[PDB]
Amino acid sequence: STISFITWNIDGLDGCNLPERARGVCSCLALYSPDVVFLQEVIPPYCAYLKKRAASYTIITGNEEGYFTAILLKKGRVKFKSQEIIPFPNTKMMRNLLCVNVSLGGNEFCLMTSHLESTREHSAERIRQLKTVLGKMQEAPDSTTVIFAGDTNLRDQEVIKCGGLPDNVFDAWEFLGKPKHCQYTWDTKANNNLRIPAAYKHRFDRIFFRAEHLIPQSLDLVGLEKLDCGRFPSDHWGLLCTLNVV
Ligand SMILES: [Mg+2]
C-alpha cells in the first residue's frame, strides 16, 4: 500500500489576503487529497477556516494561541491513536515538536512536525531543536514508522556542517536522488508574497523518516499557482510526498 502527505508553511503571520490564501491552500489540498497534512505558521482564525473548509481532515494543533503547527489526518483513512507535544525549552518563538501517533492501513505511524527556530542568528537553537526532533525520532519503537515533515528553516549548510543526519534517519529528498524540480521550497524569485526583489532560495521544508518498510516514491512542490489577489497561498511552496510501505 501507499501513503501520501503534504508539508506546508502556510504563512499565517502574513495578515494580507489570508482568507483567500487559506482558500487557496485548501483547494490545493483538495486537489491532491493527501492522507496527512503537516502545516506550520497556522493561526487560530486560519485554523477555524481549516476546520470549516478542510472538513475531510481531523485537525491536531501544536498550540491554541499565537502561531503554531498542525497535523491534518484524512478521515476514514487515518485513525488517530494519540498526540504528544514535545517542548523546545529555549525557543523564543513558541516552537515545539508535534507528534501524532496514528494507524494507517495496517501500519503504525508516528507523524511529527515542527517549525524550527527562524532566522540565521538562531542557528544554534535551530540545531538543538533539530537534535531534539532526531532524538524523538530515535525514541519510537522499531515497529512504528516514524515520519517527520516540516519547516526546518535549515540553511547555510547547517546539517552537513553539523556532521549530517544519523545513519537510520533519511531525508526523503536525498533518498530520491536530490531532484531539482522540488529542491527549493522557499524561493523569492518564483514566489512574490514577501515582495523581496533579491533572489533567495532554501530547502527549508524537509521530510525525515525512520523505518526498516518505507520507500519514498515521489516528491513534488505544491501551491505554485497565483490566486485572485495576484499572490501565492504562502511565501513557501508546499511539499507533496508519496511513500510505499512494505
Ligand atoms: Mg511565515
Side-chain angles (χ1 to χ4, degrees):
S1 189
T2 67
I3 72 172
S4 69
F5 58 83
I6 284 176
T7 182
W8 207 352
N9 187 315
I10 47 72
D11 197 23
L13 292 176
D14 178 22
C16 298
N17 305 108
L18 191 56
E20 178 180 332
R21 285 167 45 223
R23 289 194 289 277
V25 168
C26 288
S27 299
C28 272
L29 295 180
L31 276 176
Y32 300 103
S33 186
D35 304 318
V36 179
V37 188
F38 312 84
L39 298 179
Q40 305 84 43
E41 269 193 51
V42 182
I43 57 167
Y46 201 105
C47 189
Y49 209 79
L50 281 169
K51 289 173 183 173
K52 263 171 175 174
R53 274 193 187 264
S56 65
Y57 288 97
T58 305
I59 303 178
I60 306 93
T61 58
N63 212 27
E64 293 301 332
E65 297 181 346
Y67 66 102
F68 46 81
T69 61
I71 292 180
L72 282 53
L73 310 176
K74 173 65 72 176
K75 295 176 187 175
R77 186 99 156 82
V78 188
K79 186 176 178 180
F80 174 90
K81 297 172 68 69
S82 68
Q83 71 177 101
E84 183 178 16
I85 299 172
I86 309 300
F88 298 154
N90 304 120
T91 190
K92 306 292 162 57
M93 306 177 186
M94 303 182 290
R95 309 309 175 76
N96 56 28
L97 173 58
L98 175 59
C99 305
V100 181
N101 305 285
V102 307
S103 183
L104 179 51
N107 297 122
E108 300 296 344
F109 284 89
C110 184
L111 304 174
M112 293 172 56
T113 197
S114 178
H115 179 199
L116 302 190
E117 212 78 350
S118 297
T119 80
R120 309 168 185 177
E121 54 265 25
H122 291 90
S123 177
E125 177 59 20
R126 168 164 57 255
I127 296 303
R128 290 192 291 269
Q129 291 175 2
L130 182 61
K131 285 178 60 155
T132 302
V133 171
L134 295 172
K136 181 55 167 178
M137 289 184 78
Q138 296 304 337
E139 281 189 4
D142 302 336
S143 61
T144 307
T145 299
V146 186
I147 297 167
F148 170 92
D151 188 347
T152 70
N153 265 311
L154 292 166
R155 69 197 76 194
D156 302 328
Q157 301 71 52
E158 272 160 349
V159 172
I160 65 97
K161 189 183 297 300
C162 290
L165 300 170
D167 294 327
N168 66 335
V169 180
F170 298 88
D171 188 309
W173 179 73
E174 297 184 343
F175 188 95
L176 293 164
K178 302 181 177 187
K180 61 173 176 290
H181 71 254
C182 66
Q183 172 167 355
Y184 297 105
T185 62
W186 188 79
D187 187 351
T188 61
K189 184 179 177 61
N191 191 296
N192 66 341
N193 282 32
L194 297 174
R195 299 186 299 156
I196 299 170
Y200 308 112
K201 43 179 171 291
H202 297 101
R203 191 165 73 84
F204 287 153
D205 304 271
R206 303 192 185 186
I207 298 161
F208 305 139
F209 63 90
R210 192 214 62 176
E212 309 194 51
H213 289 43
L214 187 68
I215 302 171
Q217 290 305 296
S218 76
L219 194 60
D220 289 274
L221 299 171
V222 299
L224 276 65
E225 283 198 336
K226 289 179 180 178
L227 310 176
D228 288 337
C229 65
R231 309 178 67 218
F232 299 95
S234 170
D235 59 323
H236 294 243
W237 305 134
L239 265 181
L240 169 64
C241 181
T242 68
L243 311 88
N244 286 1
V245 290
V246 302

PDB file of all heavy atoms in Angstrom, residues 90-93 95 116-129 152-156 158 202 204:
ATOM      1  N   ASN A  90      13.977  26.305  25.089  1.00  0.00           N
ATOM      2  CA  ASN A  90      14.672  27.567  24.850  1.00  0.00           C
ATOM      3  C   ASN A  90      14.219  28.280  23.590  1.00  0.00           C
ATOM      4  O   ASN A  90      14.883  29.201  23.117  1.00  0.00           O
ATOM      5  CB  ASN A  90      16.174  27.325  24.784  1.00  0.00           C
ATOM      6  CG  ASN A  90      16.694  26.643  26.022  1.00  0.00           C
ATOM      7  OD1 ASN A  90      17.260  25.552  25.956  1.00  0.00           O
ATOM      8  ND2 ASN A  90      16.485  27.272  27.168  1.00  0.00           N
ATOM      9  N   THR A  91      13.090  27.858  23.038  1.00  0.00           N
ATOM     10  CA  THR A  91      12.519  28.569  21.910  1.00  0.00           C
ATOM     11  C   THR A  91      12.073  29.963  22.351  1.00  0.00           C
ATOM     12  O   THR A  91      11.551  30.145  23.452  1.00  0.00           O
ATOM     13  CB  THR A  91      11.332  27.817  21.295  1.00  0.00           C
ATOM     14  OG1 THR A  91      10.970  28.445  20.063  1.00  0.00           O
ATOM     15  CG2 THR A  91      10.124  27.811  22.230  1.00  0.00           C
ATOM     16  N   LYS A  92      12.305  30.944  21.486  1.00  0.00           N
ATOM     17  CA  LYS A  92      11.863  32.309  21.728  1.00  0.00           C
ATOM     18  C   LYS A  92      10.668  32.619  20.835  1.00  0.00           C
ATOM     19  O   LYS A  92      10.187  33.752  20.790  1.00  0.00           O
ATOM     20  CB  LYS A  92      13.007  33.292  21.471  1.00  0.00           C
ATOM     21  CG  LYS A  92      14.281  32.976  22.258  1.00  0.00           C
ATOM     22  CD  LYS A  92      14.094  33.181  23.758  1.00  0.00           C
ATOM     23  CE  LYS A  92      15.169  32.460  24.565  1.00  0.00           C
ATOM     24  NZ  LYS A  92      16.552  32.869  24.184  1.00  0.00           N
ATOM     25  N   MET A  93      10.184  31.590  20.142  1.00  0.00           N
ATOM     26  CA  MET A  93       9.189  31.759  19.094  1.00  0.00           C
ATOM     27  C   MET A  93       8.089  30.710  19.201  1.00  0.00           C
ATOM     28  O   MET A  93       7.447  30.372  18.206  1.00  0.00           O
ATOM     29  CB  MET A  93       9.858  31.684  17.723  1.00  0.00           C
ATOM     30  CG  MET A  93      11.020  32.654  17.541  1.00  0.00           C
ATOM     31  SD  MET A  93      11.794  32.446  15.925  1.00  0.00           S
ATOM     32  CE  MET A  93      13.196  33.545  16.065  1.00  0.00           C
ATOM     33  N   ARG A  95       8.077  27.619  19.508  1.00  0.00           N
ATOM     34  CA  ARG A  95       8.267  26.450  18.667  1.00  0.00           C
ATOM     35  C   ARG A  95       8.288  25.177  19.508  1.00  0.00           C
ATOM     36  O   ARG A  95       8.745  25.174  20.649  1.00  0.00           O
ATOM     37  CB  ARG A  95       9.559  26.584  17.859  1.00  0.00           C
ATOM     38  CG  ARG A  95       9.691  27.912  17.099  1.00  0.00           C
ATOM     39  CD  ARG A  95       8.457  28.222  16.259  1.00  0.00           C
ATOM     40  NE  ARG A  95       8.527  29.534  15.628  1.00  0.00           N
ATOM     41  CZ  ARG A  95       9.264  29.819  14.562  1.00  0.00           C
ATOM     42  NH1 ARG A  95      10.022  28.885  14.000  1.00  0.00           N
ATOM     43  NH2 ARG A  95       9.252  31.047  14.064  1.00  0.00           N
ATOM     44  N   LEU A 116      11.004  24.778  13.084  1.00  0.00           N
ATOM     45  CA  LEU A 116      12.219  25.048  13.851  1.00  0.00           C
ATOM     46  C   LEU A 116      12.530  26.536  13.869  1.00  0.00           C
ATOM     47  O   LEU A 116      12.121  27.272  12.968  1.00  0.00           O
ATOM     48  CB  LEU A 116      13.415  24.278  13.286  1.00  0.00           C
ATOM     49  CG  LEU A 116      13.299  22.755  13.202  1.00  0.00           C
ATOM     50  CD1 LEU A 116      14.652  22.148  12.848  1.00  0.00           C
ATOM     51  CD2 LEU A 116      12.761  22.158  14.496  1.00  0.00           C
ATOM     52  N   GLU A 117      13.248  26.955  14.909  1.00  0.00           N
ATOM     53  CA  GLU A 117      13.567  28.359  15.145  1.00  0.00           C
ATOM     54  C   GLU A 117      13.991  29.063  13.866  1.00  0.00           C
ATOM     55  O   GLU A 117      14.773  28.526  13.086  1.00  0.00           O
ATOM     56  CB  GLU A 117      14.675  28.478  16.193  1.00  0.00           C
ATOM     57  CG  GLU A 117      14.585  29.729  17.053  1.00  0.00           C
ATOM     58  CD  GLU A 117      13.527  29.632  18.139  1.00  0.00           C
ATOM     59  OE1 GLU A 117      12.729  28.673  18.125  1.00  0.00           O
ATOM     60  OE2 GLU A 117      13.501  30.519  19.019  1.00  0.00           O
ATOM     61  N   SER A 118      13.463  30.268  13.662  1.00  0.00           N
ATOM     62  CA  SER A 118      13.667  31.022  12.429  1.00  0.00           C
ATOM     63  C   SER A 118      14.923  31.890  12.465  1.00  0.00           C
ATOM     64  O   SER A 118      15.560  32.034  13.506  1.00  0.00           O
ATOM     65  CB  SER A 118      12.445  31.902  12.155  1.00  0.00           C
ATOM     66  OG  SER A 118      11.284  31.120  11.941  1.00  0.00           O
ATOM     67  N   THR A 119      15.250  32.472  11.310  1.00  0.00           N
ATOM     68  CA  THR A 119      16.362  33.412  11.143  1.00  0.00           C
ATOM     69  C   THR A 119      17.729  32.742  11.243  1.00  0.00           C
ATOM     70  O   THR A 119      17.872  31.652  11.794  1.00  0.00           O
ATOM     71  CB  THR A 119      16.325  34.569  12.180  1.00  0.00           C
ATOM     72  OG1 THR A 119      16.848  34.126  13.440  1.00  0.00           O
ATOM     73  CG2 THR A 119      14.914  35.114  12.353  1.00  0.00           C
ATOM     74  N   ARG A 120      18.734  33.423  10.704  1.00  0.00           N
ATOM     75  CA  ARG A 120      20.098  32.918  10.691  1.00  0.00           C
ATOM     76  C   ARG A 120      20.700  32.926  12.089  1.00  0.00           C
ATOM     77  O   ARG A 120      21.328  31.956  12.513  1.00  0.00           O
ATOM     78  CB  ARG A 120      20.972  33.756   9.754  1.00  0.00           C
ATOM     79  CG  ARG A 120      20.407  33.947   8.353  1.00  0.00           C
ATOM     80  CD  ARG A 120      21.185  35.019   7.595  1.00  0.00           C
ATOM     81  NE  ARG A 120      20.608  35.308   6.284  1.00  0.00           N
ATOM     82  CZ  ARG A 120      21.068  36.235   5.447  1.00  0.00           C
ATOM     83  NH1 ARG A 120      22.117  36.979   5.779  1.00  0.00           N
ATOM     84  NH2 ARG A 120      20.477  36.421   4.275  1.00  0.00           N
ATOM     85  N   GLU A 121      20.493  34.027  12.804  1.00  0.00           N
ATOM     86  CA  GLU A 121      21.172  34.253  14.075  1.00  0.00           C
ATOM     87  C   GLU A 121      20.767  33.243  15.147  1.00  0.00           C
ATOM     88  O   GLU A 121      21.437  33.124  16.169  1.00  0.00           O
ATOM     89  CB  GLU A 121      20.910  35.681  14.574  1.00  0.00           C
ATOM     90  CG  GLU A 121      19.439  36.065  14.670  1.00  0.00           C
ATOM     91  CD  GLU A 121      18.920  36.792  13.433  1.00  0.00           C
ATOM     92  OE1 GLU A 121      19.494  36.608  12.336  1.00  0.00           O
ATOM     93  OE2 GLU A 121      17.934  37.554  13.563  1.00  0.00           O
ATOM     94  N   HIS A 122      19.684  32.509  14.911  1.00  0.00           N
ATOM     95  CA  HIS A 122      19.242  31.486  15.852  1.00  0.00           C
ATOM     96  C   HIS A 122      19.574  30.091  15.340  1.00  0.00           C
ATOM     97  O   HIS A 122      18.872  29.122  15.631  1.00  0.00           O
ATOM     98  CB  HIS A 122      17.744  31.621  16.123  1.00  0.00           C
ATOM     99  CG  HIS A 122      17.396  32.848  16.898  1.00  0.00           C
ATOM    100  ND1 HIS A 122      17.103  34.053  16.295  1.00  0.00           N
ATOM    101  CD2 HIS A 122      17.335  33.071  18.232  1.00  0.00           C
ATOM    102  CE1 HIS A 122      16.855  34.957  17.225  1.00  0.00           C
ATOM    103  NE2 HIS A 122      16.988  34.388  18.408  1.00  0.00           N
ATOM    104  N   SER A 123      20.665  30.003  14.588  1.00  0.00           N
ATOM    105  CA  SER A 123      21.159  28.731  14.081  1.00  0.00           C
ATOM    106  C   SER A 123      21.331  27.694  15.193  1.00  0.00           C
ATOM    107  O   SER A 123      20.870  26.558  15.065  1.00  0.00           O
ATOM    108  CB  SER A 123      22.492  28.940  13.357  1.00  0.00           C
ATOM    109  OG  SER A 123      23.030  27.706  12.918  1.00  0.00           O
ATOM    110  N   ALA A 124      21.989  28.091  16.281  1.00  0.00           N
ATOM    111  CA  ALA A 124      22.305  27.167  17.372  1.00  0.00           C
ATOM    112  C   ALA A 124      21.046  26.496  17.936  1.00  0.00           C
ATOM    113  O   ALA A 124      20.960  25.260  18.020  1.00  0.00           O
ATOM    114  CB  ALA A 124      23.055  27.900  18.473  1.00  0.00           C
ATOM    115  N   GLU A 125      20.075  27.324  18.312  1.00  0.00           N
ATOM    116  CA  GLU A 125      18.796  26.848  18.825  1.00  0.00           C
ATOM    117  C   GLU A 125      18.108  25.936  17.814  1.00  0.00           C
ATOM    118  O   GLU A 125      17.555  24.896  18.175  1.00  0.00           O
ATOM    119  CB  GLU A 125      17.892  28.037  19.171  1.00  0.00           C
ATOM    120  CG  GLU A 125      16.496  27.661  19.656  1.00  0.00           C
ATOM    121  CD  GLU A 125      16.519  26.786  20.898  1.00  0.00           C
ATOM    122  OE1 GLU A 125      17.548  26.773  21.607  1.00  0.00           O
ATOM    123  OE2 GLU A 125      15.504  26.107  21.164  1.00  0.00           O
ATOM    124  N   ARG A 126      18.153  26.332  16.545  1.00  0.00           N
ATOM    125  CA  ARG A 126      17.567  25.537  15.473  1.00  0.00           C
ATOM    126  C   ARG A 126      18.224  24.154  15.417  1.00  0.00           C
ATOM    127  O   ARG A 126      17.535  23.139  15.313  1.00  0.00           O
ATOM    128  CB  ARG A 126      17.698  26.270  14.130  1.00  0.00           C
ATOM    129  CG  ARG A 126      17.385  25.416  12.919  1.00  0.00           C
ATOM    130  CD  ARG A 126      17.146  26.250  11.658  1.00  0.00           C
ATOM    131  NE  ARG A 126      18.274  27.119  11.326  1.00  0.00           N
ATOM    132  CZ  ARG A 126      18.311  28.437  11.514  1.00  0.00           C
ATOM    133  NH1 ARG A 126      17.275  29.087  12.035  1.00  0.00           N
ATOM    134  NH2 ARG A 126      19.394  29.117  11.166  1.00  0.00           N
ATOM    135  N   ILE A 127      19.551  24.110  15.515  1.00  0.00           N
ATOM    136  CA  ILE A 127      20.259  22.827  15.528  1.00  0.00           C
ATOM    137  C   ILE A 127      19.885  21.996  16.758  1.00  0.00           C
ATOM    138  O   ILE A 127      19.692  20.779  16.664  1.00  0.00           O
ATOM    139  CB  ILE A 127      21.794  23.021  15.499  1.00  0.00           C
ATOM    140  CG1 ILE A 127      22.230  23.694  14.199  1.00  0.00           C
ATOM    141  CG2 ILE A 127      22.528  21.687  15.648  1.00  0.00           C
ATOM    142  CD1 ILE A 127      21.829  22.965  12.942  1.00  0.00           C
ATOM    143  N   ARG A 128      19.798  22.641  17.916  1.00  0.00           N
ATOM    144  CA  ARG A 128      19.411  21.917  19.124  1.00  0.00           C
ATOM    145  C   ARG A 128      17.994  21.342  19.004  1.00  0.00           C
ATOM    146  O   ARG A 128      17.727  20.198  19.414  1.00  0.00           O
ATOM    147  CB  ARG A 128      19.524  22.828  20.345  1.00  0.00           C
ATOM    148  CG  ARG A 128      20.963  23.166  20.722  1.00  0.00           C
ATOM    149  CD  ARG A 128      21.046  23.829  22.089  1.00  0.00           C
ATOM    150  NE  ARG A 128      20.471  25.172  22.093  1.00  0.00           N
ATOM    151  CZ  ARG A 128      21.150  26.292  21.846  1.00  0.00           C
ATOM    152  NH1 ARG A 128      22.450  26.254  21.569  1.00  0.00           N
ATOM    153  NH2 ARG A 128      20.523  27.460  21.879  1.00  0.00           N
ATOM    154  N   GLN A 129      17.089  22.126  18.423  1.00  0.00           N
ATOM    155  CA  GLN A 129      15.732  21.650  18.178  1.00  0.00           C
ATOM    156  C   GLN A 129      15.732  20.481  17.190  1.00  0.00           C
ATOM    157  O   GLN A 129      15.029  19.486  17.393  1.00  0.00           O
ATOM    158  CB  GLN A 129      14.858  22.784  17.659  1.00  0.00           C
ATOM    159  CG  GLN A 129      14.575  23.857  18.691  1.00  0.00           C
ATOM    160  CD  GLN A 129      13.815  25.011  18.097  1.00  0.00           C
ATOM    161  OE1 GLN A 129      13.465  24.985  16.917  1.00  0.00           O
ATOM    162  NE2 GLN A 129      13.555  26.036  18.903  1.00  0.00           N
ATOM    163  N   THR A 152      12.038  23.257   8.606  1.00  0.00           N
ATOM    164  CA  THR A 152      13.251  23.156   9.398  1.00  0.00           C
ATOM    165  C   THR A 152      14.020  24.476   9.481  1.00  0.00           C
ATOM    166  O   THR A 152      14.870  24.645  10.354  1.00  0.00           O
ATOM    167  CB  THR A 152      14.192  22.090   8.820  1.00  0.00           C
ATOM    168  OG1 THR A 152      14.724  22.552   7.573  1.00  0.00           O
ATOM    169  CG2 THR A 152      13.453  20.787   8.598  1.00  0.00           C
ATOM    170  N   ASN A 153      13.730  25.401   8.567  1.00  0.00           N
ATOM    171  CA  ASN A 153      14.440  26.680   8.496  1.00  0.00           C
ATOM    172  C   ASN A 153      15.949  26.493   8.313  1.00  0.00           C
ATOM    173  O   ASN A 153      16.733  27.425   8.487  1.00  0.00           O
ATOM    174  CB  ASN A 153      14.161  27.518   9.751  1.00  0.00           C
ATOM    175  CG  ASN A 153      13.030  28.508   9.552  1.00  0.00           C
ATOM    176  OD1 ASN A 153      12.996  29.244   8.563  1.00  0.00           O
ATOM    177  ND2 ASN A 153      12.097  28.535  10.494  1.00  0.00           N
ATOM    178  N   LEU A 154      16.351  25.286   7.935  1.00  0.00           N
ATOM    179  CA  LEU A 154      17.764  24.962   7.803  1.00  0.00           C
ATOM    180  C   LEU A 154      18.372  25.653   6.591  1.00  0.00           C
ATOM    181  O   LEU A 154      17.750  25.746   5.533  1.00  0.00           O
ATOM    182  CB  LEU A 154      17.952  23.450   7.717  1.00  0.00           C
ATOM    183  CG  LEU A 154      17.613  22.720   9.021  1.00  0.00           C
ATOM    184  CD1 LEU A 154      17.488  21.218   8.778  1.00  0.00           C
ATOM    185  CD2 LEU A 154      18.653  23.007  10.098  1.00  0.00           C
ATOM    186  N   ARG A 155      19.594  26.139   6.770  1.00  0.00           N
ATOM    187  CA  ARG A 155      20.266  26.963   5.775  1.00  0.00           C
ATOM    188  C   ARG A 155      21.764  26.924   6.028  1.00  0.00           C
ATOM    189  O   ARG A 155      22.213  26.297   6.989  1.00  0.00           O
ATOM    190  CB  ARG A 155      19.758  28.403   5.843  1.00  0.00           C
ATOM    191  CG  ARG A 155      20.178  29.127   7.119  1.00  0.00           C
ATOM    192  CD  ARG A 155      19.343  30.366   7.373  1.00  0.00           C
ATOM    193  NE  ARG A 155      18.016  30.020   7.877  1.00  0.00           N
ATOM    194  CZ  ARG A 155      16.992  30.864   7.942  1.00  0.00           C
ATOM    195  NH1 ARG A 155      17.126  32.120   7.532  1.00  0.00           N
ATOM    196  NH2 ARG A 155      15.826  30.447   8.414  1.00  0.00           N
ATOM    197  N   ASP A 156      22.528  27.599   5.172  1.00  0.00           N
ATOM    198  CA  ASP A 156      23.971  27.760   5.366  1.00  0.00           C
ATOM    199  C   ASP A 156      24.695  26.437   5.599  1.00  0.00           C
ATOM    200  O   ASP A 156      25.645  26.381   6.377  1.00  0.00           O
ATOM    201  CB  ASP A 156      24.253  28.689   6.551  1.00  0.00           C
ATOM    202  CG  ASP A 156      23.625  30.056   6.386  1.00  0.00           C
ATOM    203  OD1 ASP A 156      23.506  30.524   5.234  1.00  0.00           O
ATOM    204  OD2 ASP A 156      23.251  30.662   7.414  1.00  0.00           O
ATOM    205  N   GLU A 158      23.964  24.025   7.286  1.00  0.00           N
ATOM    206  CA  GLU A 158      23.949  23.724   8.712  1.00  0.00           C
ATOM    207  C   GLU A 158      24.004  22.221   9.006  1.00  0.00           C
ATOM    208  O   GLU A 158      24.705  21.796   9.919  1.00  0.00           O
ATOM    209  CB  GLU A 158      22.702  24.341   9.354  1.00  0.00           C
ATOM    210  CG  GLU A 158      22.906  25.786   9.822  1.00  0.00           C
ATOM    211  CD  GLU A 158      21.608  26.557  10.013  1.00  0.00           C
ATOM    212  OE1 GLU A 158      20.537  26.065   9.602  1.00  0.00           O
ATOM    213  OE2 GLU A 158      21.660  27.670  10.577  1.00  0.00           O
ATOM    214  N   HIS A 202      15.946  28.459  -0.426  1.00  0.00           N
ATOM    215  CA  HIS A 202      16.400  27.459   0.531  1.00  0.00           C
ATOM    216  C   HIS A 202      15.494  26.239   0.524  1.00  0.00           C
ATOM    217  O   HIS A 202      14.327  26.314   0.130  1.00  0.00           O
ATOM    218  CB  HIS A 202      16.454  28.042   1.944  1.00  0.00           C
ATOM    219  CG  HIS A 202      17.422  29.172   2.095  1.00  0.00           C
ATOM    220  ND1 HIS A 202      17.029  30.493   2.108  1.00  0.00           N
ATOM    221  CD2 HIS A 202      18.769  29.178   2.226  1.00  0.00           C
ATOM    222  CE1 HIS A 202      18.092  31.264   2.247  1.00  0.00           C
ATOM    223  NE2 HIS A 202      19.159  30.491   2.322  1.00  0.00           N
ATOM    224  N   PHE A 204      14.060  24.831   3.096  1.00  0.00           N
ATOM    225  CA  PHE A 204      13.610  24.923   4.482  1.00  0.00           C
ATOM    226  C   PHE A 204      12.759  23.721   4.855  1.00  0.00           C
ATOM    227  O   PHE A 204      12.876  23.173   5.949  1.00  0.00           O
ATOM    228  CB  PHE A 204      12.801  26.210   4.705  1.00  0.00           C
ATOM    229  CG  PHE A 204      13.631  27.473   4.735  1.00  0.00           C
ATOM    230  CD1 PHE A 204      13.069  28.688   4.370  1.00  0.00           C
ATOM    231  CD2 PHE A 204      14.958  27.454   5.138  1.00  0.00           C
ATOM    232  CE1 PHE A 204      13.817  29.853   4.399  1.00  0.00           C
ATOM    233  CE2 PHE A 204      15.708  28.618   5.168  1.00  0.00           C
ATOM    234  CZ  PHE A 204      15.134  29.814   4.800  1.00  0.00           C
TER     235      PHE A 204
END
